């Protein structure tokens, strides 16, 4: 029930119904097989940094081959990784005891 007068109203009339997604066109997927499945890995003290660029990061390719006892992401959510684009990524590799 409204008394007579003029009232400012918040927007309920129009809501989005379409999604427009615009990613760079990158064909090749990131070389997970080379980084994760390599014959040798460095020591902890001599740890090696590699830069990854110009690729699509699709972790599903690992599902039938790699276990990943530990997978912990800090700045971001793991469920968000498929929807994100990164300006730069580095990969540090080494071996430690459990």
């Amino acid at each position: 029930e409204i008394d007579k007068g003029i009232y400012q109203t918040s927007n309920f009339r129009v809501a989005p119904s379409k999604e427009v997604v615009r990613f760079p066109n990158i064909t090749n997927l990131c070389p997970f097989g080379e980084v994760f499945n390599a014959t040798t890995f460095p020591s902890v003290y001599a740890w090696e940094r590699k830069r990854i660029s110009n690729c699509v990061a699709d972790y599903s390719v690992l599902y039938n081959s790699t276990s990943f006892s530990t997978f912990k992401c800090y700045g971001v959510s793991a469920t968000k990784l498929n929807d994100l684009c990164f300006s730069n990524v580095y990969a540090d590799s080494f071996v430690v005891k459990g």
Partner: protein, 196 residues
């Protein structure tokens, strides 16, 4: 999303203004710069004579011309009943904005509902009175006061020959309700742990 004239640095992907609103983006596929604008342009005000009285309303759009309202409010995405208020025959332009859904009359009345910039609205009977019982929202220019003629002359005065005793009434607040709050009851009222 609209095309933009914003000039971007060679490698910057988006632009933001002082409030950190994302003003513009660069499309990765084509490298063009697009402006991003809020879904709701600005404030809209609904004018009603009272749900008791009627279900008719008028809409006032504050910043827009009457030509630009269907684009401003995205009429193509609204319901048809909203599109009725996007464009029509009863469209009026005020300094307050564009007012749609109110009949404009050239008679000036005392202000009833203030639209602004000298324009008021009311619920008079339609001037045509074809149905003879219909009443519409009517938009008019507010009347400031009664027109009066006073004739200035030298060597002529006006002197009252009579008087009236007038008693007027003046209502003044002097007090309000004295209220007390037991904040312990308001927050953590019966909980000892919360009280600690």
């Amino acid at each position: 999303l609209t095309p933009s004239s914003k000039r971007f640095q060679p490698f910057q992907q988006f632009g933001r203004d002082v409030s950190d609103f994302t003003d513009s983006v660069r499309d990765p596929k084509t490298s063009e710069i697009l402006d991003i604008s809020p879904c709701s342009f600005g404030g809209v005000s609904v004018i009603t004579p009272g749900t008791n009285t009627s279900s008719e309303v008028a809409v006032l759009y504050q910043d827009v011309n009457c030509t630009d309202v269907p684009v401003a409010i995205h009429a193509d995405q609204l319901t048809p009943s909203w599109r009725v208020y996007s464009t029509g025959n009863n469209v009026f332009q005020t300094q307050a904005g564009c007012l749609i859904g109110a009949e404009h009359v050239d008679t000036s009345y005392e202000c009833d509902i203030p639209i602004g910039a000298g324009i008021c609205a009311s619920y008079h009977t339609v001037s045509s009175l074809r149905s003879t019982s219909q009443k519409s929202i009517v938009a008019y220019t507010m009347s400031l006061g009664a027109d009066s003629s006073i004739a200035y002359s030298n060597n002529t005065i006006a002197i009252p020959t009579n008087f009236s005793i007038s008693i007027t009434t003046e209502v003044m607040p002097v007090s309000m309700a004295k209220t007390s709050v037991d904040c312990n009851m308001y927050i953590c009222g019966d909980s000892t742990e919360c009280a600690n």
